[PDB]
Amino acid sequence: TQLLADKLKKLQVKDFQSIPVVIHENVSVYDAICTMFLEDVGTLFVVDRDAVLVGVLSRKDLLRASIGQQELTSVPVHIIMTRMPNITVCRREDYVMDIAKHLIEKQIDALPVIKDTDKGFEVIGRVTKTNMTKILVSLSENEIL
Amino acid sequence: GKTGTQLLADKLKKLQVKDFQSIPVVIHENVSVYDAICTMFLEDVGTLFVVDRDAVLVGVLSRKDLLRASIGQQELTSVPVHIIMTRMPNITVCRREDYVMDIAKHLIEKQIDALPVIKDTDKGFEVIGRVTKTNMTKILVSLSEN
Ligand SMILES: Nc1ncnc2c1ncn2[C@@H]1O[C@H](COP(=O)(O)OP(=O)(O)NP(=O)(O)O)[C@@H](O)[C@H]1O
Ligand SMILES: Nc1ncnc2c1ncn2[C@@H]1O[C@H](COP(=O)(O)OP(=O)(O)NP(=O)(O)O)[C@@H](O)[C@H]1O
Ligand SMILES: [Mg+2]
Ligand SMILES: [Mg+2]
């Protein structure tokens, strides 16, 4: 069954990703909390003026910010975001099984899927524990290959 | 079934919650919203289950429930969590002997991250575990190891 596991490890991010939710690094913390409710997501990807990834924000980053303090309306997200270069990213060509291992091992809910352009990391997707959950359901209904 | 993938499917469909749950994190319903946000960080979970005096489930709190409370234009951080929690009877729960893939479908269909695993008692549901999308991710990882 090593061969079966092998074939599973060849499934790629492009076929199982979700749209990215992105915010500009100068948007306020209040604005980022709004986007996360309007978009109903749990992780936000922060980009610069040239649309290049610079940061991520999670719910707890925002909840940490929201006690107290600290004028959420006046505070730019770049002040609190988790910053590049310490963001775990993937590309559409990566194998979802490797990306599941990063979500686990890095203890995070989502990766940005980026494309390496002649500008930097442009954000083109997200892959989360929801996408993983769905792939697992699909496997159990023999709906993949 | 007749292919390796069908055999895969067949196993997946027989996994039970009791073998793939995590420890539950529970708070009393009189704890303040600030205290619940403290617990969430202290315990490193994204969903807290709320119980009453008799350790029976009465509610759940998610990260966004607490974020909404902390930034809303009413002062809600000082209030008891029972003011803001999602309340019974409208909690999706599971039991130890439920099938994991049935739970994964509810997580997806109901767009929530976690269910409490409960046991029925004569006073109501006792919280005895949690199953979340993190659990499901770990099962997916094990497939490529095993
Ligand atoms: N892809 C990522 N790469 C690097 N850091 C990340 C990434 N995703 C989130 N983070 C940071 O990692 C921390 C954990 O985020 P995440 O876990 O996804 O959400 P959380 O709401 O903060 N809690 P949790 O689910 O318990 O880990 C936060 O400080 C994030 O900003
Ligand atoms: N098991 C459950 N049964 C009923 N409601 C739940 C359950 N788990 C969470 N909820 C509620 O459903 C809403 C969405 O929860 P959940 O999704 O888990 O987290 P959020 O951080 O609020 N993010 P999201 O994953 O994007 O909807 C919140 O009001 C929760 O209180
Ligand atoms: Mg997150
Ligand atoms: Mg949450």
Swiss-Prot record, chain B:
What's this protein's name? Answer: Transcriptional repressor CcpN
Keyword check for Transport, yes or no. Answer: no
GO terms of molecular function: DNA binding
Stated role = Transcription repressor that binds to the promoter of gapB and pckA genes, preventing their expression. Acts as a regulator for catabolite repression of gluconeogenic genes.
**Record's note on what induces expression:** Constitutively expressed.
Q: Disrupted gene: resulting phenotype?
A: Relieves catabolite repression of gapB and pckA transcription. Disruption is epistatic over a yqfL deletion.
| Portion of the full-length sequence here | 64 to 209 of 212
A Gene Ontology biological process in which this protein takes part is:
carbon catabolite repression of transcription
Q: Which UniProt keywords apply?
A: DNA-binding, Repeat, Repressor, Transcription, Transcription regulation
**Which superkingdom does the taxonomy of this entry point to?**
Bacteria
The segment(s) forming the CBS domain are 20-76, 85-146
